[PDB]
């Protein structure tokens, strides 16, 4: 047992293993210890995969890098490509034209919406929604709930819900439950009434059909989704209004139509569902899962209104420590003393493992070895030994501090910035105050529940808060790319049709040595790619990815990362059913392929 | 009685799962609810840990020799297989176990078919395609990074309708989707034939949609349905959106030189 960051770790209680953690991208093992009352007193995050992209990239052409690193992840598809072209452009002093900037922003915001909405419905919802309970729902009462939760959503009739319910009934009655097989249905950890379960499952099916439409924006500008194409120096989707070309006004009109559909979905389906589910779980008292969000949050800051001008970031970033929302520290990805990665408890080796390496000096040499207190063997692990190396995920820290990253972090940072006079953060602030009023007062009043008085400071550092922030961010991203589209069309019509700067396409024009960094506010948090170029080739290429931050194992000082902290202090209804573990872990939207790369 | 599908994940990026759920004809919703029984799939399944593991034995027993094994990703042979750990054991053990009683095996995408990005030089995990590990079962390769959504669901639809594996070429790919090179029906082919090429990004030629051969397009040596079926309900494909084909459906495409280096 030991104390760290206000958490009292104790591994003397009952040990529980969850492997595989499902409804995530990639591979994770989670172990916890619970006390005599089934409260989690220890949590262990193990990334159970590695591919070695950083090693594979060595000696290759920086212009090809984006395609390799894009394949780090097909869920957050393209965000690694964006980071990569930004890193190379930074190294080579390439400024991309305005249309390429706007097209990249639109692609980034499209990914945000798609990733967030699919995550909530298809990965997260079953932690909050009991599908078997939806079968018992009354269609008329479901209709009435729908109209209170979201008046503007036109799919609300009692007959529509009856049809959906009947299809689910027949599906379950077959004895082939498919993705619902061996679920935790009926657990007391589920609190929604049948009608809310039916409404949510209906929206699950709605979202499954609609999500394929949103990505057609990627298809227009990048040829395909998943894995749209990017380009060092700009975008490949050349523009010609009067021509035959990749982009004309009809293609841009198509993009606009998809954006408008996105805005309706976020406003009418996604945000209201999360507010309603959040309210009901708040009413049940399930405010667990805050972890590091209550103290330390970080993002690099993203979406500048004016290209290459960070002061205009619409999701302004920085770092907060010790829960002090009155002081945002600037974060510099170039500073060797800020972002550093330890491997003390990871399956890698450094020359000196007592220190953290800035990614320009990063090292990735695998070292799969288990501690002496492991139960089992090297190829058949029963209980992992977290006193030694226990994960394929490195341990990123900021000036030695363990930080939570993600939409929640960005929304806390936005709120902090807006309080200190930053007008670029006005919209996220408005969203948060609106959400708090809905969760505390308006939704309870509508559903006949008592009103509460939680402040944002109390409400946001929680699994509910983390889930809320993701939905709000999706909404905000949809709104922003709507404006980006207008700016793009305006620029084109003003006579600027440029999509690529090719001045430094040829390696003969490059400095013989160079380094660069590209950052992105990816769906799951702070993403950075750091590159060293030598004689036209990749000398070093290091990625520090949002789930690397969140899912990290312990550092040299024994400090815990966001996943492990979030599970602490959480009661379990049944220690053999990982409902609460999944609910909180999923609120981070873990991408394990990303985390390990 | 819907055919059970046990969808395993090895080393992968999950782009193949994502592509599958983009299908418009048929809708993935309809595939899952009305066509197959998707009984194991990490991305979507309710159960985790021990409860998830228990599904495998149950389906394998009840539907012995009558379930489809779908594999996304691949097994690593280095690190004693523990660069991909499932249930505290190497993924390769899960793969071999589930494969033994499968009616058919689908290798989704370039990862399962050939190795894909993790198998590119120097392949630190010794990531290995499914057919080099499972050597005693019929395997259909559905390559691409990822494959087209309708190609993936098209394979499933054929298999469910006929209870047979579609006709395969010598590399194990379904002829119904991989018989044509991108270059055969590419809409830029008239430009290629007229010697009309892009030389630099966003030159006048690029703005008129000229052929991308000199920008590295690998369409002439790449077999896929991208020029005809196209992507995301026929919205576009790489070449239409202005980037050359990078050869993503072909074995070892990551190690055939820069994507921007032209074919000779
Ligand atoms: S763009 Fe590529 S596939 Fe199309 S005609 Fe040219 S070389 Fe062939
Ligand atoms: S890159 Fe791949 S998606 Fe088609 S156009 Fe070439 S095979
Ligand atoms: Cl950019
Ligand atoms: Cl390959
Ligand atoms: Cl082009
Ligand atoms: Mg890394």
Curated annotation (Swiss-Prot), chain A:
This enzyme recycles the H(2) produced by nitrogenase to increase the production of ATP and to protect nitrogenase against inhibition or damage by O(2) under carbon- or phosphate-limited conditions. One of its GO terms (molecular function) is hydrogenase (acceptor) activity. Binds 1 nickel ion per subunit. This is Uptake hydrogenase large subunit. The gene is hoxG. Coiled coil: none annotated. The keyword Metal-binding applies. Gene3D superfamilies: Cytochrome-c3 Hydrogenase, chain B (1.10.645.10). Keywords: Cell membrane, Membrane, Metal-binding, Nickel, Oxidoreductase, Plasmid. Heterodimer of a large and a small subunit. Belongs to the [NiFe]/[NiFeSe] hydrogenase large subunit family. Its cofactor is Ni(2+). InterPro entries: Ni-dep_hyd_lsu, Ni-dep_hyd_lsu_Ni_BS, NiFe-Hase_large, NiFe/NiFeSe_hydrgnase_LSU.
UniProtKB/Swiss-Prot annotation, chain B:
Its cofactor is [4Fe-4S] cluster; [3Fe-4S] cluster. Its main location: membrane. [4Fe-4S] cluster 2 binds at residues 183, 186, 211, 217. It is a peripheral membrane protein. Binds 2 [4Fe-4S] clusters. Binds 1 [3Fe-4S] cluster. Its EC number is 1.12.99.6. The lineage of its organism: Bacteria, Pseudomonadati, Pseudomonadota, Betaproteobacteria, Burkholderiales. This is Uptake hydrogenase small subunit. It is an enzyme of class 1 (oxidoreductase). Predicted to be exported by the Tat system. The position of the signal peptide cleavage has been experimentally proven. This enzyme recycles the H(2) produced by nitrogenase to increase the production of ATP and to protect nitrogenase against inhibition or damage by O(2) under carbon- or phosphate-limited conditions. [4Fe-4S] cluster 1 binds at residues 13, 16, 111, 145. GO terms for biological process: anaerobic respiration. It comes from Cupriavidus necator (strain ATCC 17699 / DSM 428 / KCTC 22496 / NCIMB 10442 / H16 / Stanier 337) (Ralstonia eutropha). One of its GO terms (molecular function) is hydrogenase (acceptor) activity. It catalyses: H2 + A = AH2. [3Fe-4S] cluster binds at residues 226, 245, 248. Keywords: 3Fe-4S, 4Fe-4S, Cell membrane, Iron, Iron-sulfur, Membrane, Metal-binding, Oxidoreductase, Plasmid, Signal. Belongs to the [NiFe]/[NiFeSe] hydrogenase small subunit family. GO terms for cellular component: [Ni-Fe] hydrogenase complex; ferredoxin hydrogenase complex; plasma membrane. Heterodimer of a large and a small subunit.
């Amino acid at each position: 047992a030991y104390a760290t960051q206000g958490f009292n770790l104790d591994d003397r209680g009952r040990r529980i293993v969850v492997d595989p953690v499902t409804r995530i991208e990639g591979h994770m093992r989670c172990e916890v210890n619970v006390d005599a009352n089934n409260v989690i007193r220890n949590a262990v995050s193990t990334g159970t995969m590695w591919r070695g992209l950083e090693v594979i990239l060595k000696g290759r052409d920086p212009r090809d890098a984006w395609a390799f690193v894009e394949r780090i992840c097909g869920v957050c598809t393209g965000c690694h490509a964006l980071a990569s072209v930004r890193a190379v452009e930074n190294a080579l002093d390439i400024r991309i034209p305005k249309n390429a900037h706007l097209i990249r922003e639109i692609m980034a915001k499209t990914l945000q919406v798609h990733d967030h909405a699919v995550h909530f419905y298809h990965l997260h919802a079953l932690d909050w929604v009991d599908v078997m309970s939806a079968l018992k729902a009354d269609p008329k009462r479901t209709s009435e709930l729908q109209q209170l939760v979201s008046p503007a959503h036109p799919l609300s009739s009692a007959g529509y819900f009856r049809d959906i319910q009947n299809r689910l009934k027949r599906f379950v009655e077959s004895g082939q439950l498919g993705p619902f097989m061996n679920g935790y249905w009926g657990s007391k950890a589920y609190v929604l009434p049948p009608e809310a379960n039916l409404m949510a499952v209906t929206h699950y099916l709605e979202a499954l059909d609609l999500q394929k439409e949103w990505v057609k924006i990627h298809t227009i500008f990048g040829g395909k989704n998943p894995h749209p194409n990017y380009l060092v120096g700009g975008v490949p989707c050349a523009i010609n209004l009067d021509g035959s070309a990749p982009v004309n006004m009809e293609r841009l009109s198509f993009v606009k139509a998809r954006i408008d559909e996105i805005i309706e979905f976020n406003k009418n389906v996604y945000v209201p569902d999360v507010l309603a589910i959040g309210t009901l779980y708040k009413q049940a008292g399930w405010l667990y899962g805050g972890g590091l969000a209550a103290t330390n949050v970080l993002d690099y800051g993203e979406y500048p209104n004016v290209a290459y001008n960070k002061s205009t970031d619409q999701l302004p970033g920085g770092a907060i420590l010790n829960g002090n929302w009155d002081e945002v520290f600037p974060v510099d990805p170039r500073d060797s003393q800020q972002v550093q990665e330890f491997v003390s408890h990871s399956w890698y080796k450094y020359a000196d493992e007592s220190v953290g390496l800035h990614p320009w000096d990063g090292v990735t040499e695998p070292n799969y070895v288990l501690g002496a207190n492991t139960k089992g063997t090297r190829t058949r692990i029963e209980q992992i030994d977290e006193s030694a190396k226990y994960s394929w995920i490195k341990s990123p820290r900021w000036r030695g501090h363990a930080m939570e990253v993600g939409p929640l972090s960005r929304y806390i940072l936005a709120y902090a910035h807006a309080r200190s006079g930053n007008k670029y953060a006005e919209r996220p602030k408005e969203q948060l105050e609106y959400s708090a009023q809905m969760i505390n007062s308006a939704i309870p009043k509508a559903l006949g529940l008592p009103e509460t008085q939680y402040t944002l400071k109390q409400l946001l550092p929680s699994t509910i808060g983390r889930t809320l922030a993701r939905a709000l961010e999706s909404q905000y991203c949809g709104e922003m790319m709507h404006s980006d589209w207008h700016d793009l069309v305006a620029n084109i019509r003003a006579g600027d049709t440029a999509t690529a700067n090719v001045d430094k396409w040829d390696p003969a024009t490059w400095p013989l040595q160079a380094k660069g960094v590209g950052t992105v506010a990816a769906p799951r948090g702070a993403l950075g790619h750091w590159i060293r170029i030598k004689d036209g080739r990749i000398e070093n290429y290091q990625c520090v990815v949002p789930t690397t931050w969140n899912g990290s194992p312990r550092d040299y000082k024994g400090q815990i990362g966001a996943f492990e902290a979030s599970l602490m202090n959480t009661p379990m209804v049944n220690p053999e059913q990982p409902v609460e573990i999944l609910r909180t872990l999923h609120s981070f939207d873990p991408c394990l392929a990303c985390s390990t790369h | 009685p819907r055919t059970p599908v046990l969808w395993l994940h090895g080393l992968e990026c999950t782009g193949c799962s994502e592509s599958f759920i983009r299908s418009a004809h048929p809708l993935a919703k309809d595939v899952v609810l009305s066509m197959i029984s998707l009984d194991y799939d990490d991305t979507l399944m309710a159960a985790a840990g021990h409860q998830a593991e228990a599904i495998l034995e149950e389906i394998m027993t009840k539907y012995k020799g009558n379930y489809i094994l779908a594999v996304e990703g691949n097994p690593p042979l280095n690190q004693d297989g523990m660069s991909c750990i499932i249930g505290g054991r190497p993924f390769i053990e899960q793969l071999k176990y589930v494969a033994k009683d499968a009616k058919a095996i689908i290798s989704w995408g370039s990862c399962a078919s050939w190795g894909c990005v993790q198998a590119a030089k120097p392949n630190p995990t010794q990531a290995t395609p499914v057919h080099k590990v499972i050597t005693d079962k019929p395997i259909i390769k559905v390559p691409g990074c990822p494959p087209i959504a309708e190609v993936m669901t098209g394979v499933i639809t054929y298999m469910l309708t006929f209870d047979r594996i579609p006709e395969l070429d010598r590399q194990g790919r379904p002829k119904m989707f991989y018989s044509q090179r991108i270059h055969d029906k590419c809409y830029r082919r008239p430009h290629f034939d007229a010697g009309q090429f892009v030389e630099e990004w966003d030159d006048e030629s690029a703005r008129k949609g000229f052929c991308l051969y000199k920008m590295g397009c690998k369409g002439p040596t790449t077999y896929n349905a991208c020029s005809t079926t196209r992507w995301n309900e026929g919205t576009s494909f790489p070449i239409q959106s202005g980037h050359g084909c990078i050869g993503c459906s072909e074995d070892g495409f990551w190690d055939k030189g820069s994507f921007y280096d032209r074919l000779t």
